[PDB]
């Protein structure tokens, strides 16, 4: 095509899945679209405290053309409510839709979404907006100062998130500890109306594939030390939709209080970065210690 970027596919599950994953970040706000030869990424940020990035790779599209030469990537911003409404009306007859193509022609042009059916094609153009000065790359995991890492199965994490949500969890604490004889302890401690509750993942290579505590440098493994991360549930719960489709989840917390969740569902890959609370109260610390001991 004559467009700078044009990607067409026959699977409509990827688009709706990505939109559903992005929904928990606000039904009426902005979404950033990054376009490059590797693929197309959707980025959202909330309150400068949490960030989500969902990547659709080149393999997911039956055809993918990126003819831009001056710039190696293209950045645009759209309103999520517009896309949500347009797709909801256009996707009412989900059985008949056969092709879906995205297109873009550089700055100053709309983002074009076309649903192609057997004999009817629907074309919608989304207006673009200036990108806010805030840089989404600011909230990133310092890969040289990982406090701990863990690999978890998607279903168990999704069940834990559902349990936390249903009890009206208000504060969450991620507790990670390692010992000898391959003893691992990964737990989520919730402060809610019920008081203090705990959800502990088993130390087996089917729900907790691996767990490591690196003493805040990613190199030296230390046993007997416990890493505790304090988060507000309003931001922690925003990964529930992503975990619903997730096949594997990788938690990585650094010393700067940044937690990164890598969700793997050819596929959809999601990155969620969140900041930790300023500090933990004495009562919360005492309750957590009593729960874990």
């Amino acid at each position: 095509l004559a467009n700078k970027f044009s990607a067409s596919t026959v699977h409509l599950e990827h688009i709706t899945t990505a939109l559903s994953c992005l929904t928990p970040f606000g039904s009426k706000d902005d979404v950033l679209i990054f376009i490059d030869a590797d693929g197309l990424s959707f980025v959202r940020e909330n309150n400068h405290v949490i960030k989500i990035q969902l990547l659709l790779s080149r393999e997911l599209f039956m055809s993918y053309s990126y003819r831009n030469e001056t710039e190696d990537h293209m950045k645009l911003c759209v309103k999520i409510n517009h896309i949500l409404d347009s797709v909801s009306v256009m996707n009412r007859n989900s059985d008949d839709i056969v092709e879906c193509t995205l297109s873009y022609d550089g700055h100053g042009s709309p983002f074009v979404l076309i649903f192609e059916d057997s004999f009817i094609s629907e074309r919608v153009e989304y207006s673009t907006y200036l990108i806010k000065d805030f840089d989404t790359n600011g909230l990133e995991l310092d890969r040289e100062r990982i406090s701990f890492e863990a690999i978890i199965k998607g279903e168990a994490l999704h069940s834990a998130l559902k349990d936390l949500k249903e009890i009206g969890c208000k504060e969450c604490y991620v507790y990670a500890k390692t010992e000898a004889n391959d003893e691992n302890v990964f737990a989520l401690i919730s402060k809610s109306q019920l008081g203090f509750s705990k959800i502990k993942l088993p130390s087996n290579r089917s729900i907790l594939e691996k767990l490591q505590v690196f003493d805040g440098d990613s190199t030296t493994v230390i046993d007997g030390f416990a890493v505790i991360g304090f988060f507000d549930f309003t931001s922690f719960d925003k990964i529930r939709k992503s975990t619903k489709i997730a096949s594997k989840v990788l938690f990585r917390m650094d010393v700067h209080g940044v937690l990164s969740v890598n969700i793997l569902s050819p596929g959809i890959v999601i990155e969620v970065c969140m900041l930790e609370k300023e500090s933990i109260d004495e009562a919360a610390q005492t309750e957590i210690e009593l729960l874990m001991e």
Binding site: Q193, D281, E282, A283, T286
Partner: protein, 315 residues
């Protein structure tokens, strides 16, 4: 980093709180006795109400402060549902405390609570007064509904005197090893107008700015309270003097006309020397000028005309 002096030197104990000596002594008596009743603490900003209530709770509950105190303020959710669930569950909690000690529910800025929540608090206080006690903190005691006031002992804090402000300022200076002069401390106290939070903020700003707290150095950053300037302007016996004050001391310093007229109304409300007829006529003229300003004509000419009319009223 280093905390600002206002938060760094917040008292931890009742003994370090100055001003309202009788009230603080009563609070210390309650703290050392234990039988704390429902209480309301009212007063102007920055005089130690929050500090006093928190210190009293800490001293009363000792190690049990974490599990025996429930603190809520205007920045938290405090609707009727909160009263129905969180406060109710806290008051129902069975906590073993030393004899004469009770759980404390601190409601800072209680005046802002909604009517429904305040009405709901009545039954909670009636049912759980045996093991729970409420400490309301507010600026306007009348903003708490009468049924709640009926159960509480009232405690009104007065504005701090220059002596107590000077004493605590000297303590802070001794702790910080700050070089100063007497005139500088007098200027700081004069500008504070009885608000100690402002006094400490201005002291820190002056110490940073020049290191030595002099009157000239204090007045370089901190300005004299504009209400006193407005009072001097209004009480001037000559129209020329009033106009000169309005120009040099208020208009040329960037004070907005709306602020000037509002301050003029507030000051005129408390002019004891003037007669009642003159006072009400001045209030009428100030109100007319305020109405003109609100329409968009916020000019120096309107303020000058208001001053001229006030002077006519005086004659």
């Amino acid at each position: 980093l280093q905390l600002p002096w206002v938060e760094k030197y917040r008292p931890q104990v009742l003994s370090d709180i100055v001003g309202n000596k009788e009230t603080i002594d009563r609070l210390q008596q309650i703290a050392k006795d234990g039988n704390m009743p429902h209480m309301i603490i009212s007063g102007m900003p920055g005089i130690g109400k929050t500090t006093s209530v928190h210190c009293l709770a800490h001293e009363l509950l000792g190690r049990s402060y974490a599990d025996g105190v429930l603190e809520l303020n205007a920045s938290d959710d405090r609707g009727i549902d909160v009263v129905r669930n969180q406060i109710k569950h806290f008051a129902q909690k069975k906590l073993h405390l030393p004899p004469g000690k009770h759980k404390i529910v601190i409601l800072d800025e209680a005046d802002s609570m909604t009517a429904g929540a305040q009405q709901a608090l009545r039954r909670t206080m009636e049912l759980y007064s045996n093991s729970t006690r409420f400490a309301f903190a507010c600026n306007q005691s009348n903003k708490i509904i009468e049924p709640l006031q009926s159960r509480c002992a009232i405690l009104r804090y007065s504005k701090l005197s220059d002596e107590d402000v000077l004493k605590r300022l000297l303590q802070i200076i001794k702790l910080e090893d700050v070089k100063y002069t007497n005139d500088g401390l007098e200027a700081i106290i004069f500008t504070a107008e009885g608000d100690m939070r402002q006094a400490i903020n201005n002291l820190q700003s002056t110490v940073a700015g020049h290191g030595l707290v002099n009157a000239d150095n204090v007045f370089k950053i901190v300005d004299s309270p504009h209400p006193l300037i407005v009072k001097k302007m209004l009480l001037a016996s000559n129209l020329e003097d009033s106009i000169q004050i309005l120009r040099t001391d208020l208009w040329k310093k960037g004070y907005s006309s709306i602020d000037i007229v509002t301050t003029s109304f507030r000051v005129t409300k408390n002019l004891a020397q003037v007669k009642e007829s003159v006072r009400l006529e001045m209030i009428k003229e100030i109100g007319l000028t305020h109405m003109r300003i609100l329409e968009g004509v916020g000019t120096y000419l309107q303020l000058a005309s208001m001053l001229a009319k006030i002077h006519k009223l005086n004659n």
